[PDB]
Design a protein around this nucleic acid. Structure first.
Ligand code: ADP
Lengths: 155, 211, 550, 78
RNA sequence: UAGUCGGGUGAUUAGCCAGACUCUAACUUAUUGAACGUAUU
């Protein structure tokens, strides 16, 4: 991981410098170049810049995945490295995952959830609390506070 | 083309200085209303309807950088390189398609009336006016060639089919001169003329309606 | 693992459900019965679910179509992207723009699906290392990336075809595994329990070849179901295969006593409607056929019920499709008398054999018949097999078609096959007049291959004038520019406006030339005389106004 | 020459201009609700500056002027 | 109109209800490793 991060330091620096001028923010989770902006029709030229910079730096060793270049807007689904971005411009787990978690908690309510699924639900709830703290409050309201407290356990 | 009347210069242009500041630094949300209130969403050189439009410079900044942040050089033409395409009309073809042209050989709609340089026909093509000799005829020909007014089909065909859609109206108006009184016929012609401004091509219909 | 696959499969994912089904089936029979399991039923319901919409057409729950196509260094394209429509996509442009290349790439991509449906881990077609790679290039390799949609359970099926040029040390590989996985799902589910299979056909320029049924073609028993995938993406439909299959169907229909007593009973109860009125000469050798119907009673009493042949239904469906889509053809059948088997059609009320068709009625009939045969053979569980899903590639759909036929070919094809994704190229404004603007993907006239992500036109082509489509979409004059007679109206405009709007010697000469060439009733002379009338009285009114303006 | 209509007969949207012309001819010329809805859907389908919309506008212009001429003739005398 | 977002109800990954968005335009992915959250500690 650290070698991979260092080998892309110059690429990250040059891409960030180019993107800040055109009001584009750039992040990379070591394989996922994410570019976003509020200016329309500004992200069209980003892939060409990426290709020319990669050819300048790494030659033919590192290449973009052209089948993995996706344009998205508020008209469609928007998720970055697993976190859905809402039309309200806030982080979310996605409606489908939230309904799955709700079903898991409902199954735990009637005692139809086994130990493996219970541990999976506890891990998912911790991840949700990290990502969507308001979802925990909503589940506390919907499924009562005592049920949630017994599900997460006590120290 | 129309004779365009200038107005008070927007204050956002005086904020920046040519040379030190780049054209991309400004926001176009301040110059577009100023262009629109005098052009009414019609192409600075083509009377194109401004559905896909951009800010156009009469003198390109590559060879005339000193004419950057001046409202006199600013114009609203059709097309947009930002939205991509192969536009070959008004400003985009002026900058890219034509090439090797002289700035002073193009009529400016700001100070020069295009009516006495250009004539619009029933067939839909624009030709220099009758009697143009010397620099006027060459200037009109250069304007037509650079702006591709006689050229790309999307303009010639559209203008021709717009003009030919009003020819029955023109015939019916002018064929009843003896029936109507001079004042009544004149006011009816004025009514016909005053509400073709809502139409797309100003002068072609004006040339098909006026003497 | 089993838990994660169960969590994904119960949410609607098809790949996880198939993985669970396979891991159950290959295990001990305690959990594997090859079927009658939750996961197998989930997969087969996902494939087979559908509903009849308000118009009476079966609509599958999970449609199958191609979403995106990317061409990297392929032929003349440095990097191109397309956004294929769900129902109909039209690609237009000048000659040598890459429409045939796009169709060829799509067919090469679909070949892997076809091969892995027919044959486990089968090998499809590959890009040519001699012609397909761009001549200029920078890396001397080409990629063709495709993404397919198969419902919400399978939102993306990425398949990439890659090839490197001759004499290159580094060879690029193809990523065709997801297509193999999807076709494995189709094939395994179909063998366990019959399902409806997709249709993949390519109709390129290699169609319109002369003759039909050249050889006996010992090629694999056209009757069997998986013969519908044989040479399906070759470019030219196997019309000889269709003729052999049609004669097979006719033999099966007329050689069944149950399927012959029905027509015998109806044929007997037709002379009674005729011989009763008169014509005592149409009974001597026709009431003898009543004895045949009586003989059919002793030739029967083994079926009693049913007596609805599947082959007869297939024949009727194919005949109805052929008659509905092709405008000139009214009927089609097989004659056995004169004991070579031959197929006859009815063109404009005249019964003609299959070999005396023209080029344009035979090519279109070949396309329609081949497509109908493949749809019928691959969709046995549908009430209307032509409503099955699939992808069909047609190149130059207006081939050998009169402008009258071009006005209805798209509508007829879309009506006969409503669930097929049609990807079509054309050079005609007449066909475009029947197609929505959103379904057209155009090439910029000044393009050398560096353009990316094609766009739809601006002007709404559906219901528009053909001349307007030529002007704005085809980028072509409605009046030829190389003809001197085309500029005569403009020249008359100039020579009339020159003095005051009045005629003179040269203007009158030009008017006489226009009248003699175009004629009296021509719209050119009408425009010229309307122009003269307008200008003369404009000049009169101008003089009148100038009189009082002094 | 080829006996082919300019617009496709099998497309419903291709008959809207003729229907508008007939529905404006039978009426007094004013844009009633029946003509207004057809004009609105023509504008929505073909576009703001399509040839169909320009032709419809020209028909409106000529019908209005013809009505004005008829009114003038009626006002001239009885 | 689609498609998308997701607040609620729902023995609950389904169905429904309310609301909202629309650059030509998401397709939800990967461990035991790395980091993050959580639990023991
Ligand atoms: N390998 C290649 N490299 C570069 N240009 C190519 C290559 N193969 C074909 N071309 C060019 O690209 C075009 C291909 O034509 P084609 O795809 O059949 O288009 P269409 O169906 O529009 O006429 C032609 O102009 C041909 O010269």
């Amino acid at each position: 991981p650290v070698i991979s991060n260092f080998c892309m330091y110059e690429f990250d620096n040059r891409i960030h410098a180019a993107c800040k001028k055109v009001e584009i923010t750039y992040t990379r989770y070591a394989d996922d170049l994410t570019f976003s902006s509020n200016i329309p029709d500004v992200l069209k030229a980003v892939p060409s810049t990426l290709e020319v910079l990669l050819k300048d730096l790494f030659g033919s060793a590192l290449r973009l995945n052209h089948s993995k270049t996706v344009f998205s807007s508020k008209a469609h689904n928007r998720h970055v490295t697993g976190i859905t971005i809402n039309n309200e411009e806030t982080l979310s787990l996605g409606r489908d995952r939230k309904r799955f978690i709700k079903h898991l908690i409902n199954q735990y309510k009637y005692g139809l959830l086994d130990n493996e699924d219970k541990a999976y639900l506890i891990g998912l709830l911790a991840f949700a609390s990290h990502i969507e703290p308001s979802f925990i409050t909503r589940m506390n309201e919907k499924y009562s506070l005592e049920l949630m407290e017994r599900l997460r356990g006590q120290r | 083309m129309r004779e365009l009347a200038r107005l008070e210069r927007p204050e956002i242009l005086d904020q920046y200085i040519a040379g030190q500041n780049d054209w991309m630094e400004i926001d176009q949300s301040a110059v577009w209303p100023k262009l629109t209130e005098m052009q009414g969403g019609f192409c600075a050189y083509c009377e194109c309807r401004l559905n896909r439009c951009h800010i156009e410079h009469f003198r390109p900044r590559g060879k005339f950088p000193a004419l950057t942040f001046i409202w006199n050089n600013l114009f609203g033409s059709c097309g947009d390189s930002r939205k991509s395409g192969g536009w070959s009309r008004c400003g985009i073809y002026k900058d890219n398609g034509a090439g090797a042209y002289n700035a002073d050989d193009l009529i400016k709609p700001d100070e020069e009336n295009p009516d006495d340089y250009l004539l619009f026909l029933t067939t839909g093509e624009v030709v220099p006016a009758i009697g143009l000799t010397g620099r006027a005829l060459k200037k009109a020909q250069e304007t037509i060639r650079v702006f591709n007014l006689n050229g790309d089909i999307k303009l010639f065909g559209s203008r021709r089919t717009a003009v030919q859609a009003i020819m029955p109206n023109v015939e019916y108006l002018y064929t009843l001169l003896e029936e109507f009184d001079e004042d009544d016929w004149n006011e009816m012609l004025r009514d016909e003329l005053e509400k073709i401004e809502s139409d797309e091509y100003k002068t072609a219909l004006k040339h098909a309606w006026t003497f | 693992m089993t838990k994660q696959y169960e969590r994904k499969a119960k949410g609607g994912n098809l790949l996880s459900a198939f993985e669970l089904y396979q891991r159950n089936s290959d295990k001990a029979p305690g959990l594997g019965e090859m079927l009658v399991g939750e996961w197998f039923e989930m997969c087969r319901d996902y494939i087979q679910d559908g509903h009849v919409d308000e118009s009476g057409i079966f609509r599958p729950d999970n449609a199958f179509y191609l979403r995106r196509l990317t061409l990297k260094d392929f032929r003349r394209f440095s990097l191109l992207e397309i956004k294929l429509e769900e129902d109909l996509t039209v690609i237009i442009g000048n000659n040598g723009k890459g429409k045939t290349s796009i169709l060829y790439a799509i067919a090469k991509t679909l070949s892997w699906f076809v091969a892995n449906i027919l044959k486990e881990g089968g090998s499809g077609q590959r890009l040519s290392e001699m012609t397909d790679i761009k001549n200029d290039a920078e890396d001397r390799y080409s990629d063709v990336s495709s993404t397919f949609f198969f419902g919400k359970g399978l939102k993306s099926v990425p398949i990439r075809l890659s090839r490197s040029a001759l004499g290159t040390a580094e060879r690029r590989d193809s990523e065709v595994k997801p297509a193999k996985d999807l076709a494995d799902i189709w094939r395994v589910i179909n063998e366990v329990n019959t399902i409806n299979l997709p249709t993949f056909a390519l109709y390129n320029v290699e169609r319109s070849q002369p003759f039909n049924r050249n050889i006996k073609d010992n090629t694999g028993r056209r009757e069997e179901r998986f013969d519908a995938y044989s040479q399906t993406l070759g470019g030219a439909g196997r019309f000889d295969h269709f003729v052999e299959w049609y004669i097979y169907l006719h033999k099966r229909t007329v050689s069944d006593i149950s399927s012959s007593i029905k027509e015998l009973e109806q044929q007997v109860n037709d002379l009674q409607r005729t011989v009763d009125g008169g014509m005592v000469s149409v009974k001597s050798l026709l009431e003898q056929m009543k004895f045949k119907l009586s003989e059919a009673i002793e030739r029967n009493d083994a079926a009693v019920s049913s007596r609805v042949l599947t082959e007869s239904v297939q024949k009727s469906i194919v005949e109805k499709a052929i008659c509905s889509v092709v405008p000139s053809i009214s009927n089609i059948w097989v004659e056995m008398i004169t004991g070579s088997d031959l197929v006859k059609v009815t063109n404009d009320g005249h019964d003609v054999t299959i070999d005396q068709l023209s080029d344009g009625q035979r090519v279109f009939l070949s396309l329609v018949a081949d497509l109908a045969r493949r749809m019928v053979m691959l969709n046995p569980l549908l009430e209307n097999p032509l409503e099955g899903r699939g992808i069909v590639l047609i190149d130059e759909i207006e081939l050998h078609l009169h402008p009258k036929w071009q006005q209805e070919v798209i509508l007829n094809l879309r009506s006969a096959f409503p669930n097929i994704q049609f990807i079509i190229t054309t050079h005609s404004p007449i066909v475009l007049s029947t197609i929505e603007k959103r379904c057209i993907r155009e090439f910029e006239p000044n393009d050398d291959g560096d353009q990316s992500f094609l766009d739809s036109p601006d002007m709404q082509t559906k219901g528009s004038e053909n001349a307007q489509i030529l002007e704005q979409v085809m980028n072509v004059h409605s009046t030829p520019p190389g003809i001197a007679e085309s500029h005569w109206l403009g020249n008359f405009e100039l020579l009339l406006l020159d003095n005051s709007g009045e005629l003179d010697n040269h203007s009158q000469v030009l008017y006489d030339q226009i009248k003699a060439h175009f004629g009296i009733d021509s719209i050119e002379l009408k425009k010229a005389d309307s122009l003269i009338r307008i200008n003369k009285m404009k000049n009169k009114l101008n003089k009148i106004r100038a009189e009082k303006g002094k």
